[PDB]
Ligand SMILES: *[C@H](O)[C@H](C[C@@H]1CCNC1=O)NC(=O)[C@H](CC(C)C)NC(=O)OCc1ccccc1
């Protein structure tokens with residue numbers, strides 16, 4: 178199995194650069210609005226302790242340089258929504274895809290289109306960790322790069338990049354500017370809370386193993402969801418939600434293995450280990466494949 | 480941070496089409512007025528078992544090829560065969576053709592794959608040409624004609640077209656000139672690859688990436704000569720490290736202050752002792768599908 182990103186072309190067509198003063202980052206151009214992180218309006222000195230409402234009062238439409246490549250897009254209005262700036266421009270992007278704005282849950286995965294100066298540089302799969310960080314790959318100038326999923330030509334944007342935490346993981350917002358997790362867009366000392374393993378995704382990977390014929394771990398036990406959740410937390414595993422049980426439905430049906438039966442199989446792995454054996458060729462339980470990712474890879478969805 | 484990252488696929492997405500001959504369907508690459516696709520599209524499901532391609536091709540007409548770009552059919556006005564690749568001349572030029580080149584990559588080099596089905600892009604991921612000329616892909620029925628590529632300043636360098644899956648689950652294909660990487664043939668028969676080896680220069684590049692990313696547990700105070708390292712590498716089915724490789728690792732050594740032969744001593748310890756259940760960049764195994772260039776591009 179490999180981490181497979183979505184094709185990025187529909188998003189590539191929406192990336193622009195936004196500059197204020199000498200601070201340049203990326204923005205997302207959909208119809209006649211450009212979305213970008215609000216700290217574009219900060220000087221380096223401002224970022225330590227910014228008063229964003231006051232900083233925005235000192236900015237006019239003509240203070241914003243928005244460029245598609247080297248081509249300027251005239252700003253005709255501006256507003257701030259939470260941690261994102263919305264710059265109304267005088268041109269509707271002809272490459273705007275069908276799109277939605279969505280707020281994802283921990284455990285969900287998405288493709289990141291890493292960009293610099295409005296120019297796409299690479300694409301990779303990320304998972305939202307339970308502590309609301311992502312283990313990304315971002316350098317200076319990457320803010321405003323977005324994360325997304327695609328379903329049948331509709332792009333669901335879920336992440337906009339804002340910052341790096343001292344442990345080297347990354348934090349950001351949805352496209353309404355609301356941070357994932359307890360982070361704020363100030364250049365202050367912030368720490369990601371203790372992370373946990375994404376149980377629903379480990380279960381998805383056990384189903385993927387079963388589908389490919391690797392099933393030694395299937396036991397003769399079962400469990401209740403509550404009993405499992407209480408034990409899983411003792412092993413630094415996330416508890417399962419009703420939604421998690423439901424999204425495992427299709428893999429459960431495909432393999433004929435009840436979700437709570439697989440939970441009991443995982444519990445044995447946690448209480449006794451792997452005892453030298455492997456699953457899908459690995460001694461470690463992978464937790465960044467969602468049940469959708471497993472079915473997406475085993476099917477030919479485009 | 481450090482991830483396996485692919486090139487943005489938009490420039491290639493605009494070139495993918497569907498090609499059908501009878502009941503066989505796969506993908507094609509549309510550049511200017513030509514569509515490139517694997518020649519086994521002309522085979523029936525049963526022809527595939529043992530095809531004679533020149534004999535099968537002379538019996539086809541232009542109208543036997545159905546090329547669809549999205550919903551729109553392109554009319555085939557000519558066809559030729561170049562090795563294992565069919566070149567279909569269409570009456571329409573692709574307005575989305577990027578600046579491009581056809582290249583044949585070297586074992587150990589990496590490229591992005593755009594997996595497609597029925598002419599529609601499905602996923603993108605990074606692959607390496609293994610020393611035994613297989614790739615570890617993720618491809619299903621209908622993925623043939625999917626391409627691999629690298630992108631440099633808006634010029635797309637096409638290096639791979641997908642043709643088949645081996646019994647072991649690894650994959651084989653050709654360059655855009657139709658010549659297979661490796662000793663494989665486009666016939667529906669079980670084929671084995673030569674014994675694979677590990678790409679040593681890539682493992683070292685990845686160890687330098689782990690250092691850049693503030694990880695050092697595997698480093699040591701020992702040192703080694705190039706020849707003494709290659710003796711141990713060969714013993715562990717690793718590829719030889721050349722002076723050219725040592726040179727290519729130069730920038731990464733200067734950035735980290737770790738001489739190449741010092742990183743070699745580190746890797747030799749890793750090979751003879753194992754990782755003892757520790758991990759490097761979240762991995763339990765030594766990763767060999769990042770080139771030195773891949774590490775530099777992502778780390779700087
Ligand atoms: C936006 O491009 C940038 C992305 C960072 C650059 C390095 N890797 C990244 O992901 N974001 C920032 O520079 C961000 C701006 C604040 C106003 C949110 N600041 C930041 O990430 O600082 C981290 C930091 C905090 C405290 C001390 C030292 C560094």
Ligand SMILES: *[C@H](O)[C@H](C[C@@H]1CCNC1=O)NC(=O)[C@H](CC(C)C)NC(=O)OCc1ccccc1
Nearest residue numbers: 618619620621622623642643644665666668669
């Ligand atoms: C083209 O879409 C397809 C890609 C395969 C399909 C399964 N996964 C893939 O990557 N290629 C073929 O179907 C190919 C046809 C030519 C060799 C004529 N055949 C193939 O990959 O099967 C090889 C094989 C050998 C022995 C047993 C089973 C399969």
